Design an enzyme around this catalytic site. Structure first.
Site, PDB file in Angstrom:
ATOM      1  N   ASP A   8      50.394  99.296  -9.933  1.00  9.19           N
ATOM      2  CA  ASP A   8      49.426 100.154 -10.609  1.00  9.19           C
ATOM      3  C   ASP A   8      49.477 100.142 -12.141  1.00  9.19           C
ATOM      4  OD1 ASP A   8      48.943 100.798  -7.815  1.00  9.19           O
ATOM      5  OD2 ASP A   8      48.966 102.912  -8.245  1.00  9.19           O
ATOM      6  N   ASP A  49      45.444 101.039  -7.482  1.00  7.25           N
ATOM      7  CA  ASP A  49      44.648 102.163  -6.993  1.00  7.25           C
ATOM      8  C   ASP A  49      43.131 101.828  -7.214  1.00  7.25           C
ATOM      9  OD1 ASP A  49      45.234 104.544  -5.729  1.00  7.25           O
ATOM     10  OD2 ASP A  49      45.055 105.850  -7.534  1.00  7.25           O
ATOM     11  N   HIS A  51      39.309 103.400  -6.118  1.00 10.86           N
ATOM     12  CA  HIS A  51      38.594 104.438  -5.420  1.00 10.86           C
ATOM     13  C   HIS A  51      37.072 104.249  -5.473  1.00 10.86           C
ATOM     14  CE1 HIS A  51      42.185 106.506  -4.543  1.00 10.86           C
ATOM     15  NE2 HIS A  51      42.477 106.855  -5.782  1.00 10.86           N
ATOM     16  N   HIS A  57      40.701 113.906  -2.770  1.00 11.07           N
ATOM     17  CA  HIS A  57      41.624 113.290  -3.711  1.00 11.07           C
ATOM     18  C   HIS A  57      41.281 113.533  -5.214  1.00 11.07           C
ATOM     19  CE1 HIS A  57      44.756 110.410  -4.875  1.00 11.07           C
ATOM     20  NE2 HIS A  57      43.877 109.666  -5.526  1.00 11.07           N
ATOM     21  N   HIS A  71      39.959 108.820 -11.293  1.00 11.67           N
ATOM     22  CA  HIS A  71      40.733 107.773 -11.952  1.00 11.67           C
ATOM     23  C   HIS A  71      40.507 106.489 -11.124  1.00 11.67           C
ATOM     24  CE1 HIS A  71      43.247 109.660  -8.847  1.00 11.67           C
ATOM     25  NE2 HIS A  71      43.802 108.462  -8.665  1.00 11.67           N
ATOM     26  N   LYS A  96      44.179  99.727  -2.717  1.00  7.91           N
ATOM     27  CA  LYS A  96      44.341 100.848  -1.757  1.00  7.91           C
ATOM     28  C   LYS A  96      43.512 102.039  -2.282  1.00  7.91           C
ATOM     29  CE  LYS A  96      48.312 101.807  -4.758  1.00  7.91           C
ATOM     30  NZ  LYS A  96      48.231 103.136  -5.393  1.00  7.91           N
ATOM     31  N   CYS A 138      54.161 106.321  -7.327  1.00  5.14           N
ATOM     32  CA  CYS A 138      53.850 105.210  -6.474  1.00  5.14           C
ATOM     33  C   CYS A 138      54.969 104.140  -6.410  1.00  5.14           C
ATOM     34  CB  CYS A 138      52.465 104.616  -6.795  1.00  5.14           C
ATOM     35  SG  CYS A 138      51.923 103.390  -5.534  1.00  5.14           S
TER      36      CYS A 138
END
Ligand SMILES: [Fe+2]
EC number: 3.5.1.19
Length: 185
Positions: A8, A49, A51, A57, A71, A96, A138
């Site tokens: 990340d 990450d 999204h 979340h 984010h 993910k 993470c």
């Protein structure tokens, strides 16, 4: 047999980002140039990450425990690799959190179907080093999943950036109690 997993190392987790971790920008360039010195990896991969729509979340009133400001949104700059950080060496990227909050690199999938542990075992990888952001989140979760899934696991502590000193201590202790090895690179 040994791979490095870069966790990340993204705009939203560095200075200026919506979830800025102080030392993130510096850490991106410390990781490059490692990679250039040693090295000694059969393979190098990264996680992100990423999204699209993760629901609860994200929140307008976030608690920084189960809800966050937006984010790493698909199609924005926050989601990209920090521009320090040579990308040359990275063989695969694992995404993910497309429809869900994600906790561990082991939830990531690459651009074909492939989950992280699958990609690694297909290449006979049996030991991993973990670096990136954040030590207390993470990185910790990815390291202990590596061990749960039967891999020999190190964190290179000098090549992580944690959010706070108190939570980073708690995290480093829980990593030893799960049997991760904490070394400098
Ligand atoms: Fe997230």
């Amino acid at each position: 047999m040994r791979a490095l997993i870069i966790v990340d190392v993204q705009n939203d987790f560095c200075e200026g980002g919506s979830l800025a971790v102080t030392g993130g920008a510096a850490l991106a360039r410390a990781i490059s140039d490692y990679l250039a010195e040693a090295a000694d990896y059969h393979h190098v991969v990264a996680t992100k990450d990423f999204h699209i729509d993760p629901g609860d979340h994200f929140s307008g009133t976030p608690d920084y425990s189960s809800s966050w400001p937006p984010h790493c949104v698909s199609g924005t700059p926050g989601a990209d690799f920090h521009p320090s950080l040579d990308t040359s060496a990275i063989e695969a990227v694992f995404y993910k959190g497309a429809y869900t909050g994600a906790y561990s690199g082991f939830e990531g999938v690459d651009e074909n179907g492939t989950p992280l542990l699958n990609w690694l075992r297909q290449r006979g990888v049996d030991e991993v080093d973990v670096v990136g952001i954040a030590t207390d989140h993470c990185v910790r979760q990815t390291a202990e999943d590596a061990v749960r899934n039967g891999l020999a696991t190190r964190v290179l502590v000098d090549l992580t950036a944690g959010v706070s000193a108190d939570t980073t201590v708690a995290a480093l202790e829980e990593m030893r109690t799960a049997s991760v090895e904490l070394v400098c690179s």
